């Protein structure tokens, strides 16, 4: 998301970790819309917990299934 927003992906990632550690524990993400600072929590942008949890479960289940196929058998055409 930082590469699509015109920001340094490494610099922003390291910045988000410093704001959530030395300052205080909170949720501060990459800015999808133009703004002048961090802490999108003020903008009241929320995502469903069941929606985000469903993504990490399907991504983990898919990654395990990919590792369970070590061979690709593709038959020819008649």
């Amino acid at each position: 998301l930082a590469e699509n927003s015109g920001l340094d992906p490494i610099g922003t990632l390291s910045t988000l970790k410093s704001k959530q550690l030395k300052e205080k524990i909170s949720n501060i993400g990459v800015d999808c819309l133009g703004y002048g600072s961090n802490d999108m929590k003020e903008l009241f942008v929320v995502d469903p917990f069941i929606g985000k949890k469903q993504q990490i479960l399907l991504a983990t289940q898919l990654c395990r299934m990919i590792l369970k196929i070590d061979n690709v058998i593709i038959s020819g055409k008649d």
Partner: protein, 465 residues
């Protein structure tokens, strides 16, 4: 594409590090190299491999210069410094894909190398040169890697007592080139004479009239040759013409002047330092002020050697330069003994310049990678991500040691991070008498930061003649 040309040199540099990677450690794999002249040599020493490899790649030759400085400064780790250099090059490959300029990559290595040394000094146990029990056990373990084992008990105090005389205090770098290992045919290992004053490489006059011994003599260095208050003189060896005429031997015999001719040209620079004298090219400029000071000069032959020894130079500018004499029967004895005691002097040299010692076997590389991973959150920006990749690049040294020893690669590495959490430097290599000086681990990281820097700073190469 100036960066893609450099990436081609990085891949070629990592290929050289992978070849040396199999030779790390005493259990490492040997490398067979066939020279163009037809000579076939093989060994596990990384310094001898890169020297005879005859690398034509311009950037890959930097590993040879670092390996030469690794043996000249620390004396150990010439193989590990090449592997550590290739790790930073592989970690920088992913950095270039993220759009990171190599200057930040090279500048962050300076702060990473200086931080790794300060962290290493915290876990290092500081030792002092006044303790002679620590230096004997340190040099004795380095002699266990050679065929000579039971005879190395008398060789341990030989290398310790020679350095302690020239160590003094705050000497910083101590050159081991002033310490000469004399290899003569005959004798045994248990027969050794320190002769702290100096030891020559040559015999005395075997003709008639030669005194072969003199008391209260002044030894000068004369590069001239006599051919168609100086008690002892030296004549440079020249095979072209005659060195010293037979008539000149009878002339100086009546004057009670000891003559030693056929002096090797390699020892001319060595004798001009320890003796504190100056070379005399012409007799017109030859004076007494360029001579030396010797209380007694005699020729003592244990068996067949017929070697002359000098003691009590007593020079203010010159220091007590000590030359070690090594005796043995077969040629392979004094040879392998020379390289074994040379590595023992390098380990002692590391303790003189930098006090303290650590336990080898990849123990500090595990904890440093753990501390830098947690301290990486204290930074910000692109430099913060470099600390994470720099910590992972330090784990290649302990991983390779586990691979070359037959043990499971990933299994042993996980056991290192697990045991080093509760204890500190306890994993046990101290019970196994494995001690690696701190200067070797310090110079290996310092030279790697400068080696990788000199690589990435080359953006192109062109024909220049």
């Amino acid at each position: 594409k100036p960066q893609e040309v450099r990436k081609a040199n990085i891949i070629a540099a990592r290929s050289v590090a992978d070849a040396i990677r199999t030779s790390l450690g005493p259990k490492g794999m040997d490398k067979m190299i066939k020279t163009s002249r037809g000579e076939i040599i093989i060994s596990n020493d990384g310094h001898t491999i890169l020297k005879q490899m005859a690398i034509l790649h311009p950037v890959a030759r930097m590993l040879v210069e670092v390996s030469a400085a690794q043996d000249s400064e620390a004396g150990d780790g010439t193989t590990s410094v090449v592997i550590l250099t290739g790790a930073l090059l592989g970690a920088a490959e992913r950095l270039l894909n993220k759009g990171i300029h190599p200057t930040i990559i090279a500048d962050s290595f300076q702060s990473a190398a200086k931080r790794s040394v300060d962290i290493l000094l915290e876990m290092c146990h500081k030792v002092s040169l006044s303790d002679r029990e620590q230096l004997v056990r340190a040099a004795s373990t380095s002699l266990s890697s050679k065929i000579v084992s039971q005879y190395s008990s008398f060789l341990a105090p030989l290398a310790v007592d020679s350095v302690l005389k020239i160590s003094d205090e705050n000497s910083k770098n101590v050159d081991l080139n002033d310490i000469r290992l004399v290899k003569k045919v005959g004798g045994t290992i248990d027969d050794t004479e320190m002769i702290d004053g100096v030891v020559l490489t040559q015999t005395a006059i075997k003709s008639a009239g030669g005194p072969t011994r003199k008391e209260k003599a002044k030894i000068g260095l004369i590069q001239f040759q006599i051919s168609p208050k100086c008690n002892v003189l030296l004549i440079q060896k020249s095979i072209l013409r005659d060195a010293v005429n037979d008539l000149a031997l009878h002339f100086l015999s009546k004057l009670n002047i000891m003559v030693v001719k056929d002096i090797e040209r390699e020892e001319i620079e060595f004798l001009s330092k320890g003796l504190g004298c100056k070379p005399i090219a012409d007799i017109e400029l030859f004076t007494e002020d360029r001579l030396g000071s010797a209380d007694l000069v005699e020729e003592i032959d244990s068996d067949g050697s017929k070697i002359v020894r000098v003691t009590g130079i007593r020079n203010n500018n010159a220091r007590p330069t000590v030359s070690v004499v090594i005796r043995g029967a077969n040629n392979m004895i004094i040879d392998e003994t020379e390289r074994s005691l040379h590595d023992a002097l390098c380990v002692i040299r590391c303790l003189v310049k930098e006090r303290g010692l650590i336990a080898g076997g990849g123990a500090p590389e595990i904890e440093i990678s753990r501390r830098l991973s947690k301290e990486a959150r204290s930074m910000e920006g692109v430099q913060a991500f470099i600390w994470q990749e720099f910590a992972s690049a330090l784990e290649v040294i302990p991983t390779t040691l586990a691979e070359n020893a037959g043990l499971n690669s990933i299994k042993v590495v996980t056991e290192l991070r697990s045991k080093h959490e509760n204890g500190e430097l306890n994993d046990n290599t101290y019970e196994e008498h494995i001690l690696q000086p701190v200067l070797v681990s310090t110079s290996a990281i310092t030279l790697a930061s400068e080696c990788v820097k000199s690589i990435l700073r080359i953006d192109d190469i062109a024909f220049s003649r």
